[PDB]
Amino acid sequence: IRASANLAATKMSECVLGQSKRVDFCGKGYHLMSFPQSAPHGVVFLHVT
Amino acid sequence: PVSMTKTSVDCTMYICGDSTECSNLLLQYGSFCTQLNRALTGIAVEQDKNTQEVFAQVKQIYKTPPIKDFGGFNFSQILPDPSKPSKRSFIEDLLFNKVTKFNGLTVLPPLLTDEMIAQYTSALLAGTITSGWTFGAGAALQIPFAMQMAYRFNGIGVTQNVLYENQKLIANQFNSAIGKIQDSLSSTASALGKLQDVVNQNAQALNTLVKQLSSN
Amino acid sequence: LIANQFNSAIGKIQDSLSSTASALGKLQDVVNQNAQALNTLVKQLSSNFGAISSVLNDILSRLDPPEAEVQIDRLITGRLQSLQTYVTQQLIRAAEIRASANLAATKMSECVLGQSKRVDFCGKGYHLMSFPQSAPHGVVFLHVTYVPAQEKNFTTAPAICHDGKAHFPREGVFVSNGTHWFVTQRNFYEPQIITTDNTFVSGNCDVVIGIVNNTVYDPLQPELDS
Amino acid sequence: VKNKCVNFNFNGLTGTGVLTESNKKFLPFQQFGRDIADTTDAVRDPQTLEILDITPCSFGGVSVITPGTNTSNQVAVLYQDVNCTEVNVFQTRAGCLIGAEHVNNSYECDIPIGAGICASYQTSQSIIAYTMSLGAENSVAYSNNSIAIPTNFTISVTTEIL
Ligand SMILES: *[C@@H]1O[C@H](CO)[C@@H](O[C@@H]2O[C@H](CO)[C@@H](O)[C@H](O)[C@H]2NC(C)=O)[C@H](O)[C@H]1NC(C)=O
Ligand SMILES: *[C@@H]1O[C@H](CO)[C@@H](O)[C@H](O)[C@H]1NC(C)=O
Ligand SMILES: *[C@@H]1O[C@H](CO)[C@@H](O)[C@H](O)[C@H]1NC(C)=O
Ligand SMILES: *[C@@H]1O[C@H](CO)[C@@H](O)[C@H](O)[C@H]1NC(C)=O
Ligand SMILES: *[C@@H]1O[C@H](CO)[C@@H](O)[C@H](O)[C@H]1NC(C)=O
Ligand SMILES: *[C@@H]1O[C@H](CO)[C@@H](O)[C@H](O)[C@H]1NC(C)=O
Numbered sequence: 001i002r003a004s005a006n007l008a009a010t011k012m013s014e015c016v017l018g019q020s021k022r023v024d025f026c027g028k029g030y031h032l033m034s035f036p037q038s039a040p041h042g043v044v045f046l047h048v049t
Numbered sequence: 050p051v052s053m054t055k056t057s058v059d060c061t062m063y064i065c066g067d068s069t070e071c072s073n074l075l076l077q078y079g080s081f082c083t084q085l086n087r088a089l090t091g092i093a094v095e096q097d098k099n100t101q102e103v104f105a106q107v108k109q110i111y112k113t114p115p116i117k118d119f120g121g122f123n124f125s126q127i128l129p130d131p132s133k134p135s136k137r138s139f140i141e142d143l144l145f146n147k148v149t150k151f152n153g154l155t156v157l158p159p160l161l162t163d164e165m166i167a168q169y170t171s172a173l174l175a176g177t178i179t180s181g182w183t184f185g186a187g188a189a190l191q192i193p194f195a196m197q198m199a200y201r202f203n204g205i206g207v208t209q210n211v212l213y214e215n216q217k218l219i220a221n222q223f224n225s226a227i228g229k230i231q232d233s234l235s236s237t238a239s240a241l242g243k244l245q246d247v248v249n250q251n252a253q254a255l256n257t258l259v260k261q262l263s264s265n
Numbered sequence: 266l267i268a269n270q271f272n273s274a275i276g277k278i279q280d281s282l283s284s285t286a287s288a289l290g291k292l293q294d295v296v297n298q299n300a301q302a303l304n305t306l307v308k309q310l311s312s313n314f315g316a317i318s319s320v321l322n323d324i325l326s327r328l329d330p331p332e333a334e335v336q337i338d339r340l341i342t343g344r345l346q347s348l349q350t351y352v353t354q355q356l357i358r359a360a361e362i363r364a365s366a367n368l369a370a371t372k373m374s375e376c377v378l379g380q381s382k383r384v385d386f387c388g389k390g391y392h393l394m395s396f397p398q399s400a401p402h403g404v405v406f407l408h409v410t411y412v413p414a415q416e417k418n419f420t421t422a423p424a425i426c427h428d429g430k431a432h433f434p435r436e437g438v439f440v441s442n443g444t445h446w447f448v449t450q451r452n453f454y455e456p457q458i459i460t461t462d463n464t465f466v467s468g469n470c471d472v473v474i475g476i477v478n479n480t481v482y483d484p485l486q487p488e489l490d491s
Numbered sequence: 492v493k494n495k496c497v498n499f500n501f502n503g504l505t506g507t508g509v510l511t512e513s514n515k516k517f518l519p520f521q522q523f524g525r526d527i528a529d530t531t532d533a534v535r536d537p538q539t540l541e542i543l544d545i546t547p548c549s550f551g552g553v554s555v556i557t558p559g560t561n562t563s564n565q566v567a568v569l570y571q572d573v574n575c576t577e578v579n580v581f582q583t584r585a586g587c588l589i590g591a592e593h594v595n596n597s598y599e600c601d602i603p604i605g606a607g608i609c610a611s612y613q614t615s616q617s618i619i620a621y622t623m624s625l626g627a628e629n630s631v632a633y634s635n636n637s638i639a640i641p642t643n644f645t646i647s648v649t650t651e652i653l
């Protein structure tokens with residue numbers, strides 16, 4: 001879980017908090033920006049590509 | 050997944066049903082479960098630390114402006130809606146409706162309750178919608194969202210021309226795309242598997258653990 | 266100003282490490298956790314584990330093998346289980362360390378060895394460079410980061426119409442201080458007068474929403490006029 | 492005797508619990524209830540035919556909220572996951588909290604109790620429990636035609652230790 005959570009924190013920083021040009025790290029296609037959404041014991045991302 | 054249910058299982062009450070003779074037997078084995086209790090406390094602190102690392106990455110809790118004039122786009126779905134009693138956006142309310150003992154098992158409450166977490170995800174969102182990356186990099190810098198898109202297109206190599214000339218079409222395409230995300234979560238539960246699997250695996254691990262008490 | 270501001274920032278690094286010990290919590294937690302694990306291991310050595318006496322030489326001396334074998338077996342099972350617990354704890358902690366080590370290896374290569382355009386992977390703010398410093402059973406990074414400081418109000422517009430043709434910026438933003446129109450770089454206020462060398466022409470006015478009317482200067486024109 | 496933490500032994504079952512009336516209806520033949528974990532939770536009173544629910548006696552973890560020994564010796568105690576009747580007593584969703592003063596003013600979290608409540612040592616000094624503050628609220632004056640361009644920079648060196 002902490003490996004996933006660190007992955008998520010990396011995503012939230014590089015994908016929500018910043019644009020990322022890393023391919024497929026933020027959903028298939030070129031990446032523009034992402035939205036965080038809370039969920040019970042997890043986070044769901046909306047990746048705009 | 051980000052965090053898992055914080056549970057604490059006490060060594061003495063759990064292993065021995067409040068028996069002094071049993072406790073004296075347990076102390077005979079020495080320091081096994083005092084490290085079990087400390088390690089399981091350590092498990093719990095990490096989960097809170099996780100939610101600190103993922104969400105609490107913003108120093109100031111921004112709020113969205115009242116009037117939703119966002120260059121023609123319709124972000125009203127992902128932004129907070131005042132009508133619902135908990136200050137939760139529509140898509141979180143869609144998940145929080147879609148997603149659904151006394152033998153030494155204690156469930157410690159999480160540090161960040163669901164409304165406060167929602168406040169972070171609102172702050173982080175309102176930061177994206179009014180600052181782009183700048184609020185993350187340093188102090189929050191105001192920017193109109195049309196330019197923020199033109200910045201981001203220039204990032205992916207498509208010049209700003211394509212944006213400004215085709216803004217209305219993308220507005221309709223994105224709004225319909227959000228609508229699809231609504232209907233896809235509202236009707237289909239296959240996508241939302243991973244959190245349910247985390248809950249199933251953990252709650253089963255506890256259910257097996259407590260079930261072991263009834264094994265001879 | 267950069268040279269002195271960086272030297273002062275190093276000075277604050279000096280003062281922060283020299284005075285505040287809360288920084289080294291993670292490495293101190295690793296060392297304390299490991300030493301406490303070994304200490305707990307020895308404490309389990311000197312624990313009876315449900316036998317007549319904790320000392321092997323004691324149980325050996327007092328009881329002969331035919332009955333003693335059960336007690337010795339109990340001490341073996343207790344110690345071996347304690348060693349199992351200790352090794353599994355060490356091995357898993359080694360795995361988390363390995364994950365941190367690999368994260369450090371990536372951070373070393375991608376941040377120290379080269380500049381990294383990744384945001385907040387190398388401390389908050391835009392990243393310039395990072396430096397390694399050795400430490401007992403760990404590495405300490407200094408992250409030299411660029412952070413914007415003082416804002417300034419400008420009115421803005423997506424594009425500029427000069428002769429009905431819409432002009433977009435190659436780099437930067439159209440900013441007006443209220444009475445004149447300038448182009449500025451995105452992360453620092455360096456106003457420049459609008460010219461055809463910083464802007465590329467495209468399309469016509471009608472399609473783009475929010476465009477303002479602004480004269481665009483052509484650097485070539487005064488050269489041909491003169 | 493009901494609604495009291497009593498050591499009980501019914502028909503020789505034995506154990507510790509809180510005897511309360513149970514709305515659950517036995518079929519006439521059944522005698523002993525049980526749980527998902529196969530432990531006794533419902534009993535039929537032998538002498539007189541009433542159905543009794545077994546609720547285990549209250550319990551919870553013991554956590555202390557303590558500031559630095561040099562700054563003072565005052566301490567406030569957290570009884571985990573018990574409501575404030577079994578025990579400046581403040582009731583929070585984490586559990587009953589004794590020896591702490593509630594304040595509606597909010598500050599940055601210093602000592603976390605859970606369910607959003609954090610403790611810190613402030614005014615003459617004492618231990619205060621408050622709803623934790625998320626950070627300084629800062630609405631941004633977002634507009635369709637307004638841009639903020641930084642005119643200055645600060646090169647801050649931050650230490651990250653792995
Ligand atoms: C920013 O939004 C405001 C409204 O909040 C705009 O003001 C009106 O905009 C409409 C559509 O452009 C015009 O028809 C009205 O004449 C405007 N009225 C006023 C009071 O100016 C404003 O034009 C918008 N600006 C930009 C850059 O789009
Ligand atoms: C820019 O204007 C906004 C309101 O329009 C104001 O809140 C902000 O302080 C201004 N910036 C400066 C540097 O004065
Ligand atoms: C710029 O000029 C055109 C041509 O007259 C006009 O229609 C348009 O309204 C102008 N734009 C603004 C923002 O005044
Ligand atoms: C006193 O000691 C505690 C820890 O024992 C520490 O947190 C606190 O800051 C110290 N206070 C002073 C004034 O040194
Ligand atoms: C705690 O006990 C009191 C006394 O009966 C009761 O009024 C209150 O509702 C209890 N709290 C909860 C959360 O049940
Ligand atoms: C806020 O202060 C008032 C008066 O000082 C008090 O009655 C009230 O209980 C406080 N709010 C909270 C949530 O404690």
